[PDB]
Design a protein around this ligand. Structure first.
Ligand SMILES: Nc1nc2c(ncn2[C@@H]2O[C@H](COP(=O)(O)OP(=O)(O)O)[C@@H](O)[C@H]2O)c(=O)[nH]1
Ligand SMILES: [Mg+2]
Length: 165
């Protein structure tokens, strides 16, 4: 059995949780994935010379069920869309939930600003997202599930944080 890294995708609706997951898993940009469907994925990848298994829980939004899922997670990709300010505002809600369940302010966590390809319709500045990440002591990365920009990066960077726990 190889090392297993459990990642959880969180964020408000339509930010790109599923598209990022499927782009990472199948190298395809899926634009119509059922908004209400939560699923898990698993695949073997090579992380810095070592073959490891990554498990990704793509959440879709009772309390006991959601808490158990967060407890099982080892790292979190907190996603928002750079084109929707409200989704950025919502990241504070997920941060609070994760800290409540994990009871660890150093839990592997990346703030992910998705849909970077839509610069034209950006509502969240790089400055404000970076500032929030700094205040939370986490790293910020902008991705595009459409062009694949930084998609592998966020998953691999998070795995390195899980490995370093
Ligand atoms: N242009 C663009 N559209 C994206 C991107 N990521 C997701 N989308 C679109 O946004 C919609 C919602 O994405 P989805 O991954 O299903 O959101 P979820 O609710 O967070 O799972 C879909 O129509 C996607 O094709 C991205 O990086 N760029
Ligand atoms: Mg989804």
């Amino acid at each position: 059995s190889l090392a297993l890294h459990k990642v959880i995708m969180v964020g408000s609706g339509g930010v790109g949780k599923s598209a990022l997951t499927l782009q990472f898993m199948y190298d395809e940009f899926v634009e119509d994935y059922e908004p209400t469907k939560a699923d898990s994925y698993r695949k073997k990848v090579v992380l810095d010379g070592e073959e490891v298994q990554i498990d990704i829980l793509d959440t879709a939004g009772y309390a006991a069920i959601r808490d158990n899922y967060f407890r099982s997670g080892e790292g979190f990709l907190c996603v928002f869309s750079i084109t929707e300010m409200e989704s950025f505002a919502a990241t504070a809600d997920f941060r609070e939930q994760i800290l409540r369940v994990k009871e660890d302010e150093n839990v592997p966590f990346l703030l992910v600003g998705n849909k970077s390809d839509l610069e034209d319709k950006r509502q969240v500045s790089v400055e404000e997202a970076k500032n929030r990440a700094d205040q939370w002591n986490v790293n910020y990365v902008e991705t595009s599930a459409k062009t694949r920009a930084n998609v592998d990066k966020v998953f691999f960077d998070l795995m390195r944080e899980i490995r370093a726990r």
